[PDB]
Write a structure and sequence with these properties.
4 strands; 336 residues; mainly alpha; globular; Peroxidase, domain 1; Peroxidase, domain 2; binds calcium ion; 2 domains; 13 helices; binds protoporphyrin IX containing FE; two-stranded antiparallel ribbon; two-stranded antiparallel sheet
Length: 336
C-alpha cells in the first residue's frame, strides 16, 4: 500500500498512522523530543493497559478492558482515581488529537508511547498494533499499582494482568525516562534517574545506591530517600531493586544493558494488548521510527563507590562498573 509523503505500508489500514505520527512528533513531542509529554505519554500506556483483572473476571465480575482507551473515554471517572493523579493533563491533550484522525483512543495511547519512546536516546522500538475498539466501560478502581504497595502485592497485581516478576522489572525500565509531579509537588519534574531522556540502565544503578538525602522538606507516602540531589526515589522501586524475587533481574539490566530494550519491547507488546486479541489487530509497527543512540555503559555517579551499592542478588555478584569523574552535578528537573 501507498501512504502520504511517499511512504509505504504493507497494510493499507496503517496509512493513517503516518499522519498521526507527523502530528504528535510536532504538536505534542516538540520535533520528536524525549521530554515531559513523552514521559507522561509512556506512563499513560500503563494506566490504560493495567485496568485488567482476569481474577475479577473469573468471579462473574467486570475486570476492566485493558488497553481499551477507557481512561480517555471515561476520563472524568478514571482520572479521579487516586492512583491516577496528574494523569488528566496528558489525557486532555491527547483527546482532541485522536479525534481529528478518528483513531480509537486505545490505539492512540499505545501509539504515542511507542512513538515518544523512540525519541529517547537508545530508546526502544515498541510493536504497534491497531484496531482496538472505541467502545468499552470504565476501569474498576484500585487496579493500578501504587508506589507504596508492597512488592508482594505489586507482583500479584501484575501477575493477575499477565506478567511474571522478570517482566515487571523489564517494564519498569520506563523509569529511565521518568519524573514525578504528585508525590511531592514542590519537587515536581525531578527524575527517577540522572538521565531522564536517555533510555539507559542508569535507573537500575541509582536505585541500588543507598538513600542518603531528603530532597524536599520532608518525605512522602510512596517516597523514600534519594541517593543524589535533583533525583526522586519511589518506595516501590527501592524495594523491587532489593527484593529477592526481583533483585537479580534488576541487576541483569546493569550487567547486560543490551538486554534492556528487547526485554522491554517484548513486555510492552504484551501490555499494549491487554484485553486485546493480537490476531484481531493489524501490524502497523512500520510507522514507529527506528530509535537513534548506542547502548551507554552504566556508571556509578560522582561521589559514589561500590560501597554505596546495596547488592541484593544472591546468584550473581554486582558488576565492576566505573565511577564518573569530577564532583556530582545536581540533576536538573525535566522542563515544564
Ligand atoms: C509496577 C508498578 C508501577 C508503579 C508503582 C509506578 C509508579 C510511578 C509513580 C508514583 C510515578 C510518579 C507519578 C507522579 O506522581 O507524577 C511514576 C512515573 C512514571 N511511570 Fe511508573 N509505575 C509502575 C509501572 C510503570 C510502568 C509499567 C510504566 C510503563 C511501561 C511506567 C512508566 C512511567 C513513566 C514513563 C513515568 C514518568 C511520568 C512523568 O515523568 O511525567 N510505570 N510511576
Ligand atoms: Ca483501560
Ligand atoms: Ca535514563
Amino acid at each position: 500500500a501507498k501512504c502520504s509523503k511517499g511512504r509505504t505500508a504493507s497494510n493499507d489500514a496503517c496509512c493513517v498512522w503516518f499522519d498521526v505520527l507527523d502530528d504528535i512528533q510536532e504538536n505534542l513531542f516538540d520535533g520528536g523530543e524525549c521530554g515531559e509529554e513523552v514521559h507522561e505519554s509512556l506512563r499513560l500506556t500503563f494506566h490504560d493497559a493495567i485496568g485488567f483483572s482476569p481474577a475479577l473476571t473469573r468471579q462473574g465480575k467486570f475486570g476492566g478492558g485493558g488497553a481499551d482507551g477507557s481512561i480517555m473515554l471515561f476520563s472524568d471517572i478514571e482520572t479521579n482515581f487516586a492512583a491516577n493523579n496528574g494523569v488528566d493533563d496528558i489525557v486532555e491533550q491527547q483527546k482532541p488529537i485522536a479525534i481529528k484522525h478518528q483513531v480509537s483512543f486505545g490505539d492512540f495511547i499505545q501509539f504515542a508511547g511507542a512513538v515518544g519512546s523512540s525519541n529517547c536516546a537508545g530508546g526502544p522500538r515498541i510493536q504497534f498494533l491497531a484496531g482496538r475498539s472505541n467502545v468499552t466501560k470504565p476501569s474498576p478502581d484500585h487496579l493500578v499499582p501504587e508506589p507504596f504497595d508492597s512488592v508482594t502485592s505489586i507482583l500479584a497485581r501484575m501477575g493477575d494482568a499477565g506478567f511474571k516478576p522478570d517482566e515487571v522489572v523489564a517494564l519498569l525500565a520506563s523509569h529511565s525516562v521518568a519524573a514525578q509531579d504528585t508525590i511531592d509537588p514542590k519537587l515536581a519534574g525531578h527524575p527517577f534517574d540522572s538521565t531522564p531522556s536517555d533510555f539507559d540502565s542508569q535507573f537500575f544503578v541509582e536505585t541500588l545506591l543507598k538513600g542518603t538525602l531528603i530532597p524536599g522538606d520532608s518525605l512522602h507516602k510512596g517516597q523514600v530517600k534519594s541517593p543524589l540531589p535533583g533525583e526522586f526515589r519511589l518506595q516501590s522501586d527501592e524495594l523491587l531493586a532489593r527484593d529477592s524475587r526481583t533483585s537479580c533481574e534488576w541487576q541483569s539490566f546493569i550487567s547486560n544493558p543490551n538486554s534492556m530494550v528487547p526485554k522491554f519491547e517484548r513486555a510492552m507488546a504484551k501490555m499494549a494488548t491487554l484485553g486485546q486479541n493480537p490476531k484481531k489487530l493489524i501490524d502497523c509497527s512500520e510507522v514507529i521510527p527506528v530509535p537513534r543512540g548506542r547502548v551507554k555503559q552504566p556508571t556509578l555517579p560522582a561521589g559514589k563507590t561500590i560501597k554505596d551499592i546495596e547488592a541484593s542478588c544472591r546468584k550473581a555478584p554486582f558488576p565492576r562498573l566505573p565511577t564518573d569523574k569530577g564532583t556530582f552535578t545536581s540533576i536538573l528537573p525535566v522542563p515544564s
